[PDB]
């Protein structure tokens, strides 16, 4: 096949051109994102029961929906929360490879049929079924600087004027408003209502009658009276449009003549739909837009288009309104790409310099400079064919493959340059012989490296999806490189290289290059003499090898493992968690201290704090909040002391002073989509209808037992909330019937006033919005206020709640969890330092089997994923080694010689582990894929050494030591050339301190370290392996 294209260099150029255009086309229309889809498809059902407690929501909504989630395909598990903010969230997580669109419609279809079984109030609110694919391109903040607008005023402006135009912008898939559009708020007064003998029931009846759409008909409609001249539509009553119109709603006409209007018993204003959350941006009222990419879109183009649309919205903003960008992935992705393109261009420049240093003619330096781009472009076409995106994982996948690509180019050209020097043949004949010596090996190497990388793609769940990004990228780049090494580079070598007269090793030349040739020729003789001495005393080097294999095994266990390294992403967040029962105002006071600290003490670093009162991740409530700290640019924050690492630790230390508030800062995880992913995720389950309290006691028993093994388990705590005092009020049925008060009037009056009530819709400036009636704050704060609410009896007398009610304090759950339809309590925790998460899980299972009768357990999330990913691991490791062995056995026609190659593996791994341990890094995915590319290139070097040695023994009838010494002599230059270029190539990644350096460090250090040992050790140890193996067998 190389012989075919040496005679046909134009054909070779055409294939290179077709690969180049196919790849060029792919680079134009490939999707660009930070990370691809990794988490398995999950669908989230969401609903609101206004003014509902956790139990009411669970027992009327959550259980009814859960009971109806049948006949849906590929469901792994189902979990739900029901909380005191009137909210339920049911998350159905599906098998990896499930069509998310099919999964969503099947869930939504089963919900549709369940809707008639839910309460009126929930049906009216609606139940949202959406794909739980939370990955924001950016968060656009909208604020008011001149104090003219509330957060509700800003949210409504963004809803009406901004949101829809962003939704319509190119590449924008989903848009989420951070706040509500206006609602017509009727703030009722119980004193005014009682004075005119009215109730919330009367207010709701009046609003429904006088804010509605009445159907009329037509003038001269069919069937008509023949001779009818005119056909016209009749417009009757239509919805109200103003606070003034709602003010004029007639409640009753008094006997004296005067009219009672709605404005006489209630304050009427446009407000928010709910007041649970107070968003502030550096102390100022705020709203915003959470924006996500459409599938197959470009991050850079979309982000530019969003800014272009916001730009032409600027002129129409009311005074004081400003756009801000507290979160934007585009700057990070912009650098991630550029820093990879720089590595790929620098790597090609370094090859040029190294190629010139040794071979010392410009015609040779061009051949890799052509061939490497052709393979990289080709790789993009194969990414596009497999439906992959240009992302952080696929990009660093190519950087890790650049060592393998560069080697294929160097190996082929070097071997032609040598054959020309030693035998004096012209370029075309020399290339033909040279390719004859390596073509079988290169095809053998392609199969071995496929066996190393392809099995990595067949890991399941989230971790397997991440490994599949590197696998397809490296296998594709490596495969094309071999096709290019057999088609194009032979052709280029035969048509571009100058002849070399027999014996001309450049020793006769003058200056630096003359000195270098004579220097390198000495060093080659020093090397071959040195191996000669090593091959006399092989027994010693087997003992030194077993020390390397033991040294490896120790570091492999001692080095702590992670998934992906934390990054200075330009943002982080601070959790504010006040004690249970604490009010919105108390939480605001803590967030204000937090916001004050960041703009005072970190005024050089911090650009903005986005304080969100009422939203914690552990659960919604007045007693919780989060501040999202946005930093200034990476350039303006010099040194490690002004990074997210340092600011986090100072902030946590500073905020530990604050009393009656657990407050701490922490960096975002690399993949926000994937979550945190460290330790385990446990579900304790009520399997025998024990109830909340008996499940609580069982949980506390398990937590207390977990605390007695700090050697194994650390930070074992519940993810859920604790029971809180709640105001139990008992309506006396007998007394209500006696006074002639209906229960429906009592419960509506209580609910509407204290909880709020969504009555119906109205139209504000040609936009449909909700009407809420609720008590003005003054009259729904304390138990004493209950007595101030009056209900009209049948006989017309007004009765206070005190007459027919009793109340007491008791404890109940503000957040009831469920797992697979049964009541549950999620427990988080991680393995203690030194122990594996596998051991931690095994203990939690043992502790759990000694809990009360009817208490079961299950593993969820990362623990579900890890427990079934661990099962695959051994079988994939096995298949890899078995196929590598079988490929080498077919290459060499020997069951034993394979071992001479396969023994190289620890030589690469030791230096990687020394570099990682020395620099204080982790056994992460970048390190692990780095090991494979180190093992691959050292294995590739070893294969050509053994191939050359065996062929000298087989063809030229040479002795074992003669052939081995001659082989390593011929292979010294190309190995050192690749190693010099590739180690200098990954040097900037190692030292890098800037944006995305955590990933670059994880890639570079495990490769540089691995390559220094893999080179220095293999040039001495490979000949030992070959000789010792060849002696032991046959």
């Amino acid at each position: 096949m190389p012989n075919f294209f040496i005679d046909r260099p134009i054909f070779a150029w055409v294939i290179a051109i077709i690969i180049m255009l196919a790849g060029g086309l792919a680079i134009l229309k490939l999707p660009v994102a930070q990370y691809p889809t990794i988490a398995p498809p999950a669908v989230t059902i969401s609903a609101s029961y206004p003014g509902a407690d956790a139990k009411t929501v669970q027992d009327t909504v959550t259980q009814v929906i859960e009971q109806n989630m049948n006949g849906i395909d590929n469901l792994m598990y189902m979990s739900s929360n029901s909380d005191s903010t009137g909210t339920v969230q049911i998350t159905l997580t599906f098998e990896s490879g499930t069509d998310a669109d099919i999964a969503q419609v099947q869930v939504q279809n089963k919900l549709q049929l369940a809707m008639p079984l839910l309460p009126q109030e929930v049906q009216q609110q609606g139940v949202s079924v959406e794909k739980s694919s939370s990955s924001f391109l950016m968060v656009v903040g909208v604020i008011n600087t001149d104090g003219t607008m509330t957060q509700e005023d800003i949210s409504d402006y963004v809803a009406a004027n901004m949101k829809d135009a962003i939704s319509r912008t190119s590449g924008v898939g989903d848009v989420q408003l951070f706040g509500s559009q206006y609602a017509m708020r009727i703030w009722m007064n119980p004193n005014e209502l009682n004075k005119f003998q009215l109730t919330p029931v009367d207010v709701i009846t009046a609003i429904k009658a006088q804010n509605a759409q009445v159907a009329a008909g037509q003038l001269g409609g069919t069937p008509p009276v023949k001779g009818q001249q005119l056909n016209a539509s009749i417009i009757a009553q239509t919805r109200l449009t103003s606070t003034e119109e709602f003010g004029k709603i007639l409640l009753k006409v008094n006997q004296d003549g005067s009219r009672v209007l709605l404005r006489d018993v209630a304050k009427i204003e446009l407000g928010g739909e709910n007041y649970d959350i107070i968003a502030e941006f550096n102390g100022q009222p705020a709203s915003g837009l959470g924006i996500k990419l459409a599938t197959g879109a470009a991050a850079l183009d979309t982000a530019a288009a969003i800014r272009a649309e916001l730009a032409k919205m600027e002129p129409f903003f009311p005074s004081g309104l400003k756009i801000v960008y507290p979160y934007d992935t585009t700057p990070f992705v912009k650098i991630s790409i550029h820093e990879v393109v720089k590595t790929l261009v620098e790597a090609i420049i370094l090859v040029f310099l190294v190629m010139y240093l040794f071979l010392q003619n410009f015609r040779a330096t061009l051949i890799p400079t052509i061939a490497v781009p052709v393979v990289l472009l080709g790789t993009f076409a194969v990414l596009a064919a497999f439906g992959f995106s240009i992302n952080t994982l696929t990009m660093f996948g190519m950087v890790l493959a650049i060592g393998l690509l560069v080697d294929d180019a160097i190996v082929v050209v070097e071997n032609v340059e040598r054959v020309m020097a030693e035998e004096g043949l012209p370029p075309k004949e020399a290339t033909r012989k040279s390719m004859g010596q390596i073509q079988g090996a290169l095809v053998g190497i392609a199969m071995v490296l496929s066996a190393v990388f392809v099995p990595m793609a067949f890991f399941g769940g989230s971790t397997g999806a991440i490994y599949r990004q590197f696998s397809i990228t490296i296998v594709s780049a490596m495969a094309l490189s071999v096709l290019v090494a057999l088609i194009l580079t032979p052709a280029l070598c035969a048509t571009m290289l100058k002849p070399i007269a027999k014996g001309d090793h450049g020793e006769g030349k003058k200056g630096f290059f003359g000195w270098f040739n004579r220097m390198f020729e000495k060093s080659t003789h020093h090397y071959t003499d040195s191996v000669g001495g090593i091959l006399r005393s092989t027994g010693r080097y087997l003992v030194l090898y077993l020390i390397i294999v033991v040294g490896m095994a120790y570091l492999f266990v001692r080095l702590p493992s992670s998934f992906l390294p934390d990054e200075d992403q330009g943002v982080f967040m601070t959790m504010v968690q006040l004690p249970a029962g604490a009010t919105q105002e108390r939480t605001q006071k803590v967030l204000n201290e937090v916001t004050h600290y960041y703009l005072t003490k970190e005024k050089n670093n911090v650009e903005s704090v986005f304080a969100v009162n009422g939203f914690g991740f552990a659960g919604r409530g007045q007693n919780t909040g989060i501040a999202f700290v946005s930093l200034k640019d990476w350039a303006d924050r010099p040194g490690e002391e002004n990074k997210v690492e340092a600011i986090t630790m100072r902030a946590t230390r500073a905020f530990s002073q604050i009393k009656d508030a657990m407050v701490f800062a922490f960096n975002l995880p690399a993949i926000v989509e994937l979550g945190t992913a460290t330790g385990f995720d446990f579900e304790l389950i009520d399997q025998a209808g024990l109830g909340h309290e008996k499940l609580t006691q069982a949980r506390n028993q398990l937590l207390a037992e977990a605390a007695k093994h700090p050697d194994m388990l650390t930070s074992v705590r519940p993810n859920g909330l604790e029971d809180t005092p709640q105001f139990k009020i008992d309506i006396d049925q007998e007394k209500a019937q006696a006074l002639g008060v209906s229960i429906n009037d009592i419960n509506t009056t209580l609910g509407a006033a204290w909880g709020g009530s969504y009555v119906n819709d109205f139209i504000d400036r040609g936009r449909v919005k909700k009407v809420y009636v609720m008590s003005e704050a003054k009259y729904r704060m304390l138990p004493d206020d209950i007595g101030d609410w009056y209900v009209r009896a049948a006989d017309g007398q007004m009765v206070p709640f005190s007459a027919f009610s009793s109340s007491r304090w008791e404890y109940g759950s503000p957040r009831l969890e469920r797992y697979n339809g049964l009541p549950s309590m999620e427990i988080l925790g991680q393995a203690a330092p030194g122990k594996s998460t596998g051991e931690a899980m095994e203990l939690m299972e043992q502790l759990a089997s000694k809990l009360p009768t009817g208490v079961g357990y299950d593993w969820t999330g990362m623990s579900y994923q890890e427990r079934l990913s661990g099962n695959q691991a051994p079988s994939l490791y096995a298949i890899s080694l078995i196929v590598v062995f079988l490929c080498l056995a077919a290459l060499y026609e020997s069951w034993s010689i394979p071992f001479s190659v396969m023994l190289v593996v620890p030589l690469g791994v030791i230096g990687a582990l020394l570099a990682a341990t020395f620099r204080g890094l982790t056994n992460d995915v970048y390190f692990q894929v780095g090991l494979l590319t180190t093992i691959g290139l050292s294995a590739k070097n070893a294969i050509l050494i053994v191939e050359f040695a065996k062929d000298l023994m087989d063809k030229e009838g040479k002795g074992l030591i003669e052939a081995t010494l001659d082989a390593v002599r011929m292979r010294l230059r190309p190995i050192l050339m690749t190693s010099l270029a590739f180690i200098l190539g990954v040097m900037p990644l190692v030292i890098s301190t800037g944006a995305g350096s955590g990933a670059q460090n994880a890639v570079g250090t495990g490769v540089m370290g691995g390559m220094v040992t893999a080179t220095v050790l293999a040039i001495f140890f490979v000949p030992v392996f070959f000789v010792v193996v060849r002696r032991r067998f046959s």
């Binding site: 006396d732 007491r808 304090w809």
Partner: protein, 156 residues
Amino acid sequence: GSDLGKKLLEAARAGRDDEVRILMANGADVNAADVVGWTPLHLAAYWGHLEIVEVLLKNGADVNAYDTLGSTPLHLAAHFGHLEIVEVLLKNGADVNAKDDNGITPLHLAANRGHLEIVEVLLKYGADVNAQDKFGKTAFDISINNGNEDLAEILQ
């Protein structure tokens, strides 16, 4: 209010005997209370932790402390069927006829959840069987409406 007061409220609720023991040594306020007005004795009586009820009383806890709606620890203990705690509270001078803001006695609550042993103990310490709540209802009225024959015998 105080620092150790909050920790005693949490520890009394959770039933951590050894932590309460230390807090009693370090002079933690036994008359610390929630927003709702629950002392550690309320919380220990509610969640049924007997040891802590005894310990708090030895450390001069108010046995007849009332919450914002007028409920005593005896109300909670008698309502939630903690016979041992009911007996202990009564021996340390708990008002057996204590009324909450609704006029609901510990007898009324004990009768409602149908705790036979606790009703007898309350009666032994001189519980007013004829005591009425705001709706004129006795413990007997609760027993006949609940249809508890065994309870209805004792309250005649």
